[PDB]
Each structure stands twice: as C-alpha cells, then as structure tokens.
Amino acid sequence: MDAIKKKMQMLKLDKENALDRAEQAEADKKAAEDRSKQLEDELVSLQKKLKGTED
Template identity: 50%
Template sequence: MDAIKKKMQAMKIEKDNALDRADAAEEKVRQMTDKLERIEEELRDTQKKMMQTENDLDKAQEDLAVANTNLEEKEKKVQEKQSQTAFNSTIYWMNDRFINIASRYTTLHRIALRYTALHYAAPHCTTLHYATPHYTATPHYIDRV
C-alpha cells in the first residue's frame, strides 16, 4: 500500500509538474500571440504609411510632369518673344538704314541737280543765283517719323 501511495504521490507530483509546464507554455503562447498582434499592427501601420508615401510620390510625379509641361510652354513663349524682339530690332535697324540711305540719296540727288544746273546754266546766265535750283521736295519714299 505504501508503494501505491508513493506511486500516487509521484503521479500527483508529475501531474502538478505537467500542469505547471502547461500553464507556463500557455503563458508563453499568450505572450507570443500578443507580440504577434503588435507586430501585425505595426506591419499594417507601416503598409498604410507606405501606401500614403506611394500616393504622395504619384501625386508629386504628376505635379512634376505638369510643371515640366508648363515650363516647356513658358520657355517656348520666351523663345518666341526673343525671336520677335530680334526680328523687330532687325526691322527697326533696316528702317533706320533705309532712311539714312534715302537721305544720302536725296543729298546726292540735290548735289547732282545743282551741278547739272550750274554746269548747263552757267554759260547762259549772268548771275549764279538764277542758275541754282531751289529743290525742296522730299522724295515720296522717305518716311519721316
């Protein structure tokens, strides 16, 4: 009977030890489950942040594309304005040059007329005053500004 009591006592101790180990294992499982839930929550938060960052990146890329398009349009307009300005400068320079040449032509024409009049009128006139032509008309192609 002592042997049975000892055997039962040993089995009871073994059962208590097994229950303690089971409780410890359940506690460890609960701790690991809690840790897993925290990690999964962190993962979801990180995924949300990553999605938001990707959305922000897409928006920034779209904004950059729009800004680049606007920049190209503005640069094209600036280039057109510069070309127009250069063209206008050339036109103004050519107009000034034309006026200068026309003025020289008029002066040379007047001198030629005076010379011709003096050359042919001098033998027939008694005074030089009557031989000098009074040419005051401006040619029609000179644009006075």
C-alpha cells in the same frame, strides 16, 4: 498501506509537473501571439504611411 501511498505521491508529482508545464506553455503561446499580432499591426501602419508617401 505503505508502498501505495508512495506510488500515489509519485503520480501526484507527475500531475503537478505536467500541469505546471501546460500552464506555462499556454502563457508562452499567449505572449508570442500577442507579439506577432502587434508586429502585424505595425506592418499595416507602415503600409498606410507608404501609401500616403506615394500620394
């Protein structure tokens, strides 16, 4: 009819916005966790270098 189509369009705008936000948040999590794990690896290498210096 008439109002039904507009209501469907609203329900679809919510769909697109929610899905896009979810995808963006997932990409953010991937990037942040990669950052953290690379920092942890750098910390490990520093520990090993400290061990060599102690030797």
